[PDB]
Amino acid sequence: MIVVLVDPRRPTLVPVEAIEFLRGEVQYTEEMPVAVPWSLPAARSAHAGNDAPVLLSSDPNHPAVITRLAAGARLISAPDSQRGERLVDAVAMMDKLRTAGPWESEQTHDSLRRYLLEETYELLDAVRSGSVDQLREELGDLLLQVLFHARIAEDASQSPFTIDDVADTLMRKLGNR
Amino acid sequence: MIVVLVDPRRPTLVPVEAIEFLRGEVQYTEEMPVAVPWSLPAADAPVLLSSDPNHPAVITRLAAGARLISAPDSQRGERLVDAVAMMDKLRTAGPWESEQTHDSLRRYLLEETYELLDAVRSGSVDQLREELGDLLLQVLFHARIAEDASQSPFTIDDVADTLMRKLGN
Ligand SMILES: [Mg+2]
Ligand SMILES: [Mg+2]
């Protein structure tokens, strides 16, 4: 009857419109964090029992979600993700590979200064080649440099900063203009 | 009694741990969207709903022993989505930025990357962080220009996806 889709990057928060429908019998999909069944008193898994009048999930592709939606269940959904949230996914993967990476762990600002001027020229070649499918790839290569130098400046022993401070630096500079 | 503090960027989302408590009388602070009290069909109060940790009512009630049920803190990099939004506004409201193309931006790509190298071999952390934002701007600018493309547009999220697929291998 009702399908509740939450933000996958905040699967622990629910849309305010759904809380009355969340205190009864609900089913949660298997990718929901363990925090949800411990907060919802009378909830259970979507592979347990018969179908519940409301199913709580974060995966729009999950078969049960597609099932009940096709059968005319009403959807109560969290707002769509905002432009640039995969970027937050990106800095997390940069943080992960910085520690686990043998090479990536010992690299510093000077050991990266060599690569930067190369990747700029490859981006200039992409622009002049007119092909959209590698302007995008080299654009990623330049973003990788910005996230690497930023993750390194965290390990800074004097005046260390993060990717959130450079974003503040950029925004504060566009504001005086 | 209870303070429920929500993510200011995602103000209609409540922690699951607070569902039990938004049933009776509830108070909301001024910055909350008007839509939120309208969505709690079950409408001095024991429960205060807010998005502002520096609100006076939140501070006093927490200091008085109220229990806090808060949305998780922001992850490293959420300020990048603010930067994308500000890049989007200036692409549409700034006359000069509204005309820029991939070719016309080429000029300042080489200028700022050289300045970043100048900051690395200078030691200055305040200039390293500044020239990092200048280079970051170019990536957001080029990605935003791609969104307007008539042929095969992409966005900053797409280039973020492409970096990760390459990062996976
Ligand atoms: Mg390359
Ligand atoms: Mg500069």
Author numbering:
A (entry chain B): 1 to 177
B (entry chain A): 1 to 43, 51 to 176
Share the article's original sentences.
The housecleaning enzyme of Mycobacterium tuberculosis (Mtb), MazG, is a nucleoside triphosphate pyrophosphohydrolase (NTP-PPase) and can hydrolyze all canonical or non-canonical NTPs into NMPs and pyrophosphate. The Mycobacterium tuberculosis MazG (Mtb-MazG) contributes to antibiotic resistance in response to oxidative or nitrosative stress under dormancy, making it a promising target for treating TB in latent infection patients. As a housecleaning enzyme, MazG functions at the cell nucleotide metabolism by degrading the non-canonical NTPs, preventing mutagenesis and DNA damage. Mtb-MazG mainly contains three domains, an extra N-terminal region (NE, residues 1–85) that is absent in other bacterial homologs, the N-terminal domain (NTD, residues 86–253), and the C-terminal domain.
Despite failing in the crystallization of full-length MazG, we succeeded in obtaining the MazG (1–185) protein crystals and solved the 2.7 Å resolution structure using molecular replacement of the AlphaFold2-predicted structure (AF-P96379-F1). There are six MazG molecules in an asymmetrical unit with a cell dimension of 109 × 109 × 242 Å, which includes two monomers and two dimers consisting of two identical chains. The Mtb-MazG (1–185) monomer contained eight α-helices and five β-stands, comprising two globular domains, including a primary three-layered α/β/α sandwich domain (named domain 1) and an entirely α-helices-composed domain (named domain 2). Domain 1 was composed of three α-helices (α1, α2, and α3) and five β-sheet strands (β1, β2, β3, β4, and β5), which was absent in other NTP pyrophosphatases, including B. anthracis, E. coli, and D. radiodurans MazGs. Domain 2 included five α-helices (α4, α5, α6, α7, and α8), which showed a higher B-factor than that in domain 1, indicating this region exhibited more flexibility. The two domains were connected with a short linker (Ala78-Gly84). The interface-involved residues of the swapped-dimeric MazG were located in α1 of domain 1, and α4, α6, and α8 of domain 2, of which fifteen residues formed multiple hydrogen bonds and salt bridges in relative distances within 3.5 Å. In the MazG (1–185) structure, one magnesium ion was present per subunit. The Mg2+ was coordinated by three glutamate residues (Glu119, Glu122, and Glu138) and one aspartate (Asp141). Also, the NTP-PPase activity was significantly lowered for the mutants of E119A, E122A, E138A, and D141A.
